[PDB]
Amino acid sequence: WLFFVVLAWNWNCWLIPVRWAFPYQTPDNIHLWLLMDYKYMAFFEFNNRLESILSKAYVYRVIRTTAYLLYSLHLNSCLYYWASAYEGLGSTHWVYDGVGNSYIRCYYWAVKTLITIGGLPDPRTLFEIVFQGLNYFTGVFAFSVMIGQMRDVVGAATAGQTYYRSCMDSTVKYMNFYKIPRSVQNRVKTWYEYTWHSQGMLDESELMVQLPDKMRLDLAIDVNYSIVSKVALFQGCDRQMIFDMLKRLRSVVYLPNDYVCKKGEIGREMYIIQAGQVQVLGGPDGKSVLVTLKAGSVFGEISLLAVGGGNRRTANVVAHGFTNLFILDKKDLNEILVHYPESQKLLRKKARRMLRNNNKPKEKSVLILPPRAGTPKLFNAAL
Amino acid sequence: KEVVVIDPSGNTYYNWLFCITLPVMYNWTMIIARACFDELQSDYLEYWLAFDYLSDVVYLLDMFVRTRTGYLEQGLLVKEERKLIDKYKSTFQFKLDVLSVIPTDLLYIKFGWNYPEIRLNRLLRISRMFEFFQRTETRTNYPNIFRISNLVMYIIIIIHWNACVYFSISKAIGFGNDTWVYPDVNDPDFGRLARKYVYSLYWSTLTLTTIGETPPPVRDSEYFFVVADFLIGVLIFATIVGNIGSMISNMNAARAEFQARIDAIKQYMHFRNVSKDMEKRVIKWFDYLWTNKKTVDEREVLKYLPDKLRAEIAINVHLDTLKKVRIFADCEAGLLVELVLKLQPQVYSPGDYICKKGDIGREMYIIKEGKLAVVADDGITQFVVLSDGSYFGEISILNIKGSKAGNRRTANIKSIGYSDLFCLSKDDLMEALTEYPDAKGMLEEKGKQILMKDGLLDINIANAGSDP
Amino acid sequence: VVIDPSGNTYYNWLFCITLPVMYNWTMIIARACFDELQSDYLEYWLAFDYLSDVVYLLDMFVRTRTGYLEQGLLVKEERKLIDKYKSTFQFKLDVLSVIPTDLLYIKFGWNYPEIRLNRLLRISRMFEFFQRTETRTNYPNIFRISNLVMYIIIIIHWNACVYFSISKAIGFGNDTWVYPDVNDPDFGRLARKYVYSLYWSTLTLTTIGETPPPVRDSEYFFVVADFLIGVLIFATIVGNIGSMISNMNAARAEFQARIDAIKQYMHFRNVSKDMEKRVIKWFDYLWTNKKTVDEREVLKYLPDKLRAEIAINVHLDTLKKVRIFADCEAGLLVELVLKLQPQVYSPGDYICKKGDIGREMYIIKEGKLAVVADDGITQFVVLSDGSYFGEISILNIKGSKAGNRRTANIKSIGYSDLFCLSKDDLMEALTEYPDAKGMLEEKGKQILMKDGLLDINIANAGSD
Amino acid sequence: VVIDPSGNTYYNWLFCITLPVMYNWTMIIARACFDELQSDYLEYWLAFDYLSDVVYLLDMFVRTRTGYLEQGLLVKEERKLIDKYKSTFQFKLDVLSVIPTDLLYIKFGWNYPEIRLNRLLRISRMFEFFQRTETRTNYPNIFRISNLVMYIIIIIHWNACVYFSISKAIGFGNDTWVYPDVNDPDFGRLARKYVYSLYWSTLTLTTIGETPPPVRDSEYFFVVADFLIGVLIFATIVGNIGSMISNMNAARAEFQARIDAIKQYMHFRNVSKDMEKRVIKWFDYLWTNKKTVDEREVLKYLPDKLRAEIAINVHLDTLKKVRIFADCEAGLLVELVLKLQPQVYSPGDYICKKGDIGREMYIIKEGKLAVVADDGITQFVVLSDGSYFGEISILNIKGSKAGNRRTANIKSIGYSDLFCLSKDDLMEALTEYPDAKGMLEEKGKQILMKDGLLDINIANAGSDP
């Protein structure tokens, strides 16, 4: 409906002017009016739709505005013509004898007298000053709204980049407050560059809070179901518990030659890999690279069970470069298990069985699960 | 000493303000437009010498209603003179009061009847004129026509002043001694106050729109004049465009924010490949959020009000249905108030399984407008409609002895359209009950009564109470 | 024999330096480019050069008398300051700007008295005088707009001088575009030429091209360059003005945005109209009386000590008079002081009711309250200021007559603004000093002993 | 060969490639329309055309180098780059611009360039160079306006050339509007022929018309374009400059807003004048230096791995010079230092007076402190950098027997900027190293046994059951 409606409205608003005052045009080609004489916001709504549905969000407003401008030009032309007709004389008494040039000289006269430039005309009678004033104002209005739209678009376009430099130069001046050696400058610079590129944002958490609830769960269940809901340690329990466990997770990114488990430290964390590759190293010497995990793997899981890494981590680890592995701490584990004490007893029983087999036996891979993973069965069954 | 006082915000104030505007606006034009010409002065002074005195006496009256307006002390607005006046006498804004009423209509004795330029004082009572429509904007229905109307007014008065000045300078060299200046006048068709003014106005407007369709200067006094005129026209243009730009930027700050958020969510979604069904669902939820204009959240909309107003609005909006629940009947409202103060909304999407199976269900859910149904494990016909005010989840919120394997309801419920219900919490009910140690017994007694009358397996074991 | 780099004596001397530099910046081009202004007013122009030279010389001594701070105190020994100035970048700029270059004056006679162009670079001092004077203005938007206009005038001046020079270089009257002639009776009076050239330059820099057409080669180049410069100038001006007008209308927009948000919501849930009017009048009151902002976030910028000093200076005179704080040590008092939370009421509000929780100890500041029985109006007592209204419900003691009931029925009369104090905060505060608690409860029990004291016998705690 | 897409050498080659890519954008039009200008110097036309084509094809020396990053591993490929580029886009133009072009003008001579049209396809190096350079400069202010100026000059050049072309098309002198005529000195010469046209071009591009009526149809197209593009040019330049000048200053505005709010508060509860003096002096000392920030939020969005480096860089020497913490595993200081907070501080204030039950750690740093007894008289030993006093209270040592006193009456003389640390923070931070707790406890015990006065020694367990 919109296409034909706007065509018809442009036609009926534009053809009539020259067909009421300009002398030799209303009977000359009287076919369009004769055969087409047969609170609006739908046009605005569908322009809104087209901006949304099509890549362009500016051509529609541009064409509407320039159509308004040329419509105003034509309407001013017609109204001064009718002012002359009502008064009898005036309004380009010499149109230069022909429609083919009458049209062009008419809108040339309109664009000439657009604001106040005058030129040829001289004071003839009353109301001329007021006439020139009104035309002046309408021209100024159209021009001003054009600049307004332009600055609108420029500002709305170049939005986050200014903030990006604001962060960067603020922190560089700060860090420079105390004369710190260059290495960390280079490190922080490349960190910032890599983060900013290919990501756009800087901390996706702040989007999560603004966005509602009850769909964040759907996002998390569409993203991180697999790797977690397969590990035998947390296997086979209340499905409605793991959801909070998931909801509290946090990302991090490392760089080349990055210690993560420097041997001889405590540790309280279970890492997990999303897109990268890390090497289980065997010391600063010739790289005892036993294996390098690829993706969808887990590491250091036992340390979350009542003792964080046994006051000394398993083995040294370093990274090639950019890793992007998630992180999950222990406080979350204890809080989720106290909210849902259904499985706290079974995880706890596994923990005592592990500590009781940590001293007297070795138990490489023979008695790990069946006595540990056996305790989930009856324990939560006692809920 | 008990004088009556007007309210400093009542409609009387507004109407008197509209009264005191006409005279100063009249004096801001007619004095100079009478100094310029001389064929209205000494020609129409009959009505003029009358119209002047009414405005003088209205100025005098203006000096009055200022001293009888109060100013609150401590929720109390002082309501007597002899100190309603001391502050006004001691402040500023009284020097103008001294100056701008002095009758100097005697200097005409040394200046005849051809100098109505002696009245260069009535133009100091302008703060009131400003304030009138500086303030009336906040009372109107919709602004954003008022600013442009004001700018139009100011520019028009400017051009009138300049059309005055041009004639004033013209009649100092001789009518017709040049070609730039106004022509000679003793000839006919020229000099009857209908041509002596419109022509000047035309010339002034052309000159200040600065395009140059008039004969050029020749005498070297106006080489100053035209320069100054151009240097003022530029500033006029700058002011109008800057003002309209700020206006047009301000009245659109919602769409930009909404589009920025949709941008962020689109980028994040297409950063880790998710099923496209989620894209469809997410976008067909965002459009729903936008369409009924529900972008804001009830959490933060209300966060700035003082606490009390929040209390009254909350109690008004919802206590009826809480008192409509099938258990809370004989509850001291000194509890229901803090209970109501603890509600949090939930809003849902089509085809969401709320509980659907054996789970904990440790909350309280009451339905607003929306449709819910209870089904079996599979996608079959509904068994009951939770049409308009239905609710379950009540008995779960407590923990009574000898329950029927509590907090593991296995019913199957599901949303279809859009629901937007509300939620409560067990722990909060505990903490807000802590201070009324009498109802708890009644509540648990009623719960045991209903559970027993439900024909269920309450183990009904006697309590221990062995050690008090 | 010293001064701070921030005292008003330094400010006045900063103004004092400013007078000659602006003077030097303008006259030089005109008085070397018209050649009529000199050759007849020389006696006017001995003392000015003398003055400017000696002013430069004396000022070059200031930089070795004003110290700087050494981490806690102002350096006040010159050798470092002499070393400091020697290390300053501007010192060599000073030396360049103070060079006596009139050794060529005799050699060049008076062909070019423009050789003193040297003394034209100590302008950063004018710049910092600008940047230091906006910080202490009553209302500075006007100031900056004035500075803008000053700059525009200066540029117009330079353009006019350039045009006249190019005309005299080409030769008077060989066309219909150059400056017309010199031997006529009027275009020789030294007053026509300056002003005509000013008019010329302004008409060129404006938008329309309507002046006499060009013929020669250089003038098309000149015209195009001036057109471009003019466009740039106009853009700068409009941008600056728009920036100011935006910064001025800041608050009102967001204020009305908040009000609109509230109304938009309050339409959604079908609320009643009376509170509509109440909230609207509330907003209007708070707007008019210039107390729109909320005090909490307002205060928390200063560090600890200053915040504490402000806090004590508006409260440590009422608490000194509460009944039960007869013999409390200062530290406990201050620790209490820092936990008072503003509330505000309006005429006709039930601040409390009968027989409910006793959980606060009000201390009114600037209001009026009265106790009205619900039955009609039977006002008993009106309280002016410094009213306790409490002071025992917090200090819980055994055998309370009616533990935490407070059947009083008070009500505000109009627009009172009262602080408050909680009880968990009192416990957390008193935990530090485990001594006074006993004496406080003791004297409170004595106060009760003067009247009723209980509703039952003493619950003697003879545990030990 | 292998290159990284972020390196100074890569920028230098970008500058070299972008240098001769504008010849193809300007000189071609002049030589196409202003005939007999090439005839002046054909010893330059081809003499630079060869250089242009040499570099224009040597650019592909890098489209096979400069590998793409993969899975967080460095660009280290030698054969997948070429077929990557081929499968992807930007290879089509990279050859479509590269017809040898010498097999058509042979039908027309070695004189004119208007068949070099297709070499106007490779415009990405200049765009990329412009966007890349600004992220390294110091003064991003002038760059954007310089860029816009260049663009405007170029479009003026185009319009001038097209006007003279359409002039050449029609008979010269048949109307005043067209270029006047030839067969006349300086009206049939070169320099005037284009300068005058340029002047005419700017005049007509400005909307206001000083021109005759139309000759016939198909001439008004010029003024049509003139207004249609003049409006857009002016609008965009104004918008850009306005946005940039607006954004330039906002810190001043925010500082002023804060000062305004605080002043409105203070002159409302009848604060006495002296306090107003003190607070305004403090905000002065704030703004007149570079101390006008709060560093806590500055380091907000760093990774959860850093700041221990710079931490131990700044807070380590004096902290290691203490008589309680010295015996410790470095992990202890690593956990500790990360939790401190600053305390800037104004001259002339008693930090602590005799009689005080405060509990905090206080480290002097780059200032001057000094303690008096009772009335600011008879100053005792001065406390220079790297010092403190007391600090034993922070731990509830058994038998402290005099704690909670701080009988010092300490005072500050000049701007001090010392440091602070809480107590419960220390207690929480000792949830992993229980062993050292006993040794530090006994250290305090022994030091207060002799250096401290007589200890009570009667401390014992209370109610066991």
For residues A57 and B331, what is the distance between their CA atoms, to the nearest angstrom? 58
Angle at C429 between CA C424 and CA C432, to 5 degrees: 135
Give residue C366's identity as a one-letter amino acid code.
Answer: E
Handedness of CA B40, B42, B44, B48 (dihedral sign): positive
Q: Which of C217, C290, C313 comes nearest D271 by C-beta?
A: C313
Q: Among candidates C345, B194, B211, which has minimal Cα distance to A136?
A: B211
Judge if A126 and A191 occupy the same domain. Answer: no
Instruction: Tell if the CB–CB gap between C304 and D343 is shorter than 8 Å.
Output: yes
Instruction: Among D243, D290, D306, select the one facing A151 at the smallest CB separation.
Output: D243
Query: Furthest-apart CA pair in chain A: how many Å?
Result: 119
Find, in chain D, the residue whose alpha carbon is nearest to that of C227: D202
Q: Are C408 and C371 in contact (CB under 8 A)?
A: yes
User: Could you identify the residue written with the tokens 């470095």?
Assistant: D330
Residues of chain B contacting residue A151, judged by C-beta atoms under 8 Å apart: 245, 249
* DSSP 8-class letter at C213: P
Structure tokens at C145: 């707009």
Domain range enclosing A372: 211-381
For residues B351 and B415, the answer to whether their CB atoms sit within 8 Å is yes
Regarding whether A30 and A46 lie in a shared domain, the answer is: yes
| Alpha carbon A272 to chain centroid, angstroms | 27
List, in sequence order, every residue forming a beta bridge with D342; answer none if it has no partner: D419
| Same domain membership, residue A300 and residue A188 | no
β-strand partners of B72: B77
Residues A219 and A90 in one domain: no
DSSP state of B305: S
Of B199, B201, B346, the CB nearest to A214: B346
Instruction: Give the Cα separation of C346 and C71 in Å (integer).
Output: 52
Give residue numbers after which chain A breaks (C–N above 2.5 Å): 38
In the three-class reduction of DSSP (H, G, I as helix; E, B as strand; rest coil), residue B385 is classed as strand
Question: What's the Rg (C-alpha) of chain C?
Answer: 39
Q: Is C10 helix (H, G, I), strand (E, B) or coil?
A: helix
- Spell out where chain D is interrupted, by the residue before each break (C to N > 2.5 A): none
**Collapsed DSSP state (helix, strand, coil) of residue A291:** strand
Chains that touch A (3 or more CB pairs under 8 A): B, D
Gap between the Cα atoms of A260 and A317, Å rounded: 6
Neighbours of D463 (CB within 10 A): 4
Q: Could you tell me which residues are beta bridge partners of residue B6?
A: B69
The C-alpha atoms of residue B209 and residue B230 are separated, in whole angstroms, by 8
A220 and A355 part of one domain: yes
At B306, list the tokens. Answer: 């003082």
CB atoms within 10 A of CB A350: 22
Architecture of domain C298-449: Sandwich (2.60)
* Selection from B423, D419, D206, A236 nearest residue C208 by Cα: D206
**CA-closest candidate to residue C279, choices C299, C260, C253:** C260
3-class SS of residue D170: coil
Q: How far is the C-alpha of C205 from the C-alpha of C190, rounded, in Å?
A: 24
Q: Per DSSP, what are the bridge partners of residue C371?
A: C410
Identify whether the C-beta of residue C112 lies closer than 8 Å to the C-beta of residue C29. Answer: no
DSSP states of A248-263: S-EEE---SS--SS-S
Nearest 5°: the CA angle A334, A338, A341 is: 120
Q: Return residues 344-373 of A near D (CB < 8 Å).
A: none
- Strand residue runs (E) in B88-200: none
Burial class (CB in 10 A: 0-12, 13-18, 19+), A319: buried
Question: Does residue B412 contact residue B374 with C-beta atoms inside 8 Å?
Answer: yes
| B265 Cβ contact partners less than 8 Å away, ≥ 6 residues apart | A207, A211, B282, B286
- Evaluate whether residue A202 is within a structural domain: no
Question: CA C20, C24, C25, C27 torsion: positive or negative?
Answer: positive
Q: Test D199 with C304 for CB contact under 8 angstroms.
A: no
**Quick one: how far is CA B389 from the chain centroid?**
37
Q: What is the C-alpha separation between C226 and D139, in angstroms, rounded?
A: 27
Q: Tokens 């919109």 correspond to what residue?
A: A2
- The structure tokens listed for B359 are 């789970």
First to last CA, chain B: 73
Query: C261 and B296: CB-CB below 8 Å?
Result: yes
Residue matched to tokens 């200890």:
D455
* Amino acid found at A117: I
The residues spanned by each domain of chain B are 1-139, 142-251, 254-295, 300-453
Partner chains of B (3+ C-beta pairs under 8 Å): A, C
Same domain, A192 and A220: no
Residues in chain C: 464
| Neighbouring C-alpha atoms within 13 Å toward the C-beta of B194 | 5
Q: Please, are residues D448 and D399 in contact by the beta-carbon 8 Å criterion?
A: yes
**Cross-strand bridge partners of residue A298:** A272
Amino acid at B227: V
Q: Does A206 fall in a domain? A: no
The whole-angstrom separation of Cα D74 and Cα D92 is 28
Question: Cβ–Cβ of A277/D217 closer than 8 Å?
Answer: no
The full length of chain D comes to 465
Closest CA to D31 of D124, D104, D110, D121: D110
Q: In chain D, how long is the greatest CA-to-CA distance?
A: 125
- The token duo for B55 is 């405005």
Q: Give the distance, in angstroms, between the CA of residue A202 and the centroid of all CA atoms in the same chain.
A: 12
Q: With helix as H, strand as E and coil as C, how does B416-440 read? A: CCCCCCEECCHHHHHHHHCCCCCHH
**Helix pair C304-312, D273-287: axis angle to 10 deg:** 160
User: Two tokens at A317?
Assistant: 């680890």
Residue A274 CA to residue A272 CA, distance in Å, equals 7
* Rounded Cα distance, D294 and D255, in Å: 13
Q: Do D72 and A101 touch (CB under 8 A)?
A: no
Other beta carbons within 10 angstroms of residue B246's beta carbon come to 20
- DSSP label at residue B212: -
Size of interface C-D (CB pairs under 8 A): 100
Whole-number Å distance between alpha carbons of C377 and C348: 13
What are residue A280's DSSP bridge partners? A291, A317
Residue closest to B349 by CA, chosen among B280, B295, B274, B296 = B280
Sign, Cα dihedral of D405, D406, D409, D411:
negative
Q: In what order do the strands lie in the sheet with B372-374?
A: B384-385, B372-374, B413-415
The answer to whether C245 contacts B241, with C-beta atoms less than 8 Å apart, is no
**Residue C424, both tokens:** 């968990």
**From the DSSP assignment, how many helices (H) and strands (E) are in chain D?**
18, 6
Distance, CA of D91 to CA of D85 (rounded, Å) = 7
CA distance D324 to D392: 9
Helix axes B276-291, B254-269, angle to 10 degrees: 170
Burial class of C411 by CB neighbour count within 10 A (0 to 12, 13 to 18, 19+):
buried
| A267, A300 Cβ separation under 8 angstroms | yes
Determine whether the interchain pair B220/C191 forms a contact, defined as Cβ–Cβ distance below 8 Å. yes
Dig out the tokens for D337 from the structure: 């230092």
Residue D393 annotated as part of some ligand binding site = yes
Query: Which residues lie below 8 Å from residue D199, measured CB to CB, with a gap of 6+?
Result: C214, C220, C223, C224
Distance of CA A91 to the CA centre of its chain: 55
Contact C323, C348 (CB under 8 A): no
Question: d(Cα D412, Cα D346) in Å, to the nearest integer?
Answer: 8
Give CATH for domain D305-450.
2.60.120.10
Q: Output the CA torsion sign for D160, D166, D172, D175.
A: negative
Instruction: Reduce the DSSP state of residue D444 to 3 states and report it.
Output: helix
What DSSP string describes A172-208? HHHHGGG---HHHHHHHHHHHHHHHTTT--S-THHHH
HSE-CB for A113 with a 13 A CA cutoff = 24
Cα C51 to Cα A142, C55, C101, C117, C123: the distances in Å are: 56, 6, 16, 16, 17
Residue B196 and residue A344: Cα distance in Å, rounded? 101
In angstroms, rounded to a whole number, what is the distance separating the alpha carbons of residues D240 and C239?
9
Rounded Cα distance between B48 and B42, Å, is 10
Inter-chain residue contact B249 with A151, CB threshold 8 Å: yes
Contacts 24+ apart (CB under 8 A), C354-359: C354/C407, C354/C408, C354/C409, C355/C402, C355/C405, C355/C406, C355/C407, C356/B334, C356/C405, C356/C406, C357/B435, C357/C404, C357/C406, C358/C390, C358/C393, C358/C394, C358/C404, C358/C405, C358/C406, C359/C393, C359/C394, C359/C404, C359/C422, C359/C423
Pairing type for strands B372-374 and B413-415 reads antiparallel
User: Looking at the complex, does the CB of residue A276 fall below 8 Å from at least one CB of chain D?
Assistant: yes
D242/C235 CB distance under 8 A: yes
Long-range CB pairs of A64-68, under 8 A, 24+ apart, other chains included? A65/A142, A65/A145, A65/A146, A65/A149, A67/A10, A68/A142
| A113 shares its domain with A181 | no
Resolution in A: 3.4
Does residue A203 lie within any of the structural domains? Answer: no
Q: What single string gives the DSSP state of each residue in C18-36?
A: HHHHHHHHHHHHHHHHSSS
For residue A126, how many other CB atoms are within 10 A of its CB? 10
Residue B413, strand partner residues: B374
Residue C456: DSSP 8-state = S
Does residue D367 contact residue C72 with C-beta atoms inside 8 Å? yes
Nearest of A95, A59, A70 to residue A14 by alpha carbon: A70
| H/E stretch holding A345 | helix A344-359
Phi, psi of D384 (to 5 degrees): -80, -170
Task: Say if residues B95 and B109 touch (Cβ distance below 8 Å).
Answer: no
- DSSP labels for C218-284? HHHHHHHHHHHHHHHHHHHHHHHHHHHHHHHT-HHHHHHHHHHHHHHHHHHTT--HHHHHHHHHHHH
Helix (H) or strand (E) holding B415: strand B413-415
d(CA D422, CA D432) in angstroms, rounded, equals 18
Question: How far apart (Å, rounded) are the C-alpha atoms in residues A9 and A68?
Answer: 12
What DSSP letter does each residue of C360-380 carry, written as one string?
Answer: ---EEES--EEE--SSS----
**Using CA atoms, how far apart are residues B236 and B41, in angstroms rounded to an integer?**
32
The burial class, CB within 10 Å (0-12 / 13-18 / 19+), for B11 is exposed
Contacts of A196 in chain D (CB under 8 A): none
Same-domain check for residues A147 and A181? no
Nearest to C266 by CA among B338, B291, B312: B312
- Asked if residue A137 and residue A190 are part of one domain, the reply reads no
For residue B365, the distance in angstroms to the closest alpha carbon of chain C comes to 19
Distance of CA A270 to the CA centre of its chain: 31
How many angstroms separate the CA atoms of D264 and D287, rounded?
Answer: 19
How many other C-beta atoms can be found within 10 angstroms of the C-beta atom of residue D142? Answer: 9
- Which residues of chain C have a CB within 8 Å of the CB of B308? 345, 349
Q: Which of B413, B283, B271, B353 is nearest to A214 (CA)?
A: B353
Q: C270: which residues sit within 8 A by CB, 6+ positions away? A: none
Instruction: Confirm whether A205 is domain-assigned.
Output: no
Residue D19 Cα distances to D126, D387, D424, angstroms: 9, 61, 65
Three-state helix/strand/coil letters over B148-165:
HHHHHHHHHHHHHHHHHH
Same domain for A189 and A251? no
Which fold does the domain B300-453 belong to in CATH?
Jelly Rolls (2.60.120)
Q: Which two tokens stand for residue C218?
A: 């250089």
Strands (E), D308-448: 341-343, 361-363, 369-371, 382-383, 410-412, 418-421
Task: Tell which residue, B157, B155, B161, B153, has the closest CA to residue B133.
Answer: B153
Q: Which two tokens stand for residue A219?
A: 């996002």
**Chain C residues lying within 8 Å of B70, measured CB to CB:** none
A126, A147, A212: residue with CB nearest B347: A212
DSSP-derived letter for residue B298 is H
The pair of structure tokens assigned to A222 is: 């569409």
List b or e across C198-231, with b for residues whose CB sees 16 or more CB atoms inside 10 angstroms: bbbbbbbbbeebeeeebeeeebbebbbebbeeeb
For residue D62, give the H/E element and its range. helix D60-63
Distance CA A342, CA A380 (A): 5
Cβ proximity of B208 and B232 under 8 Å: yes
B270, A219 Cβ separation under 8 angstroms: no
**C229 near C201, Cβ under 8 Å?**
no
Residue C81 distance to chain B (closest CA, Å): 48
Are residues A76 and A102 located together in one domain of the fold? yes
Per the structure block, which two tokens stand in for D30? Answer: 């002049």
- Examine the domain organization and report whether A242 and A371 are in the same domain: yes
Q: Which of residues 119-138 of A touch B (CB under 8 A)?
A: 119, 123, 126, 128-129, 132-133, 136
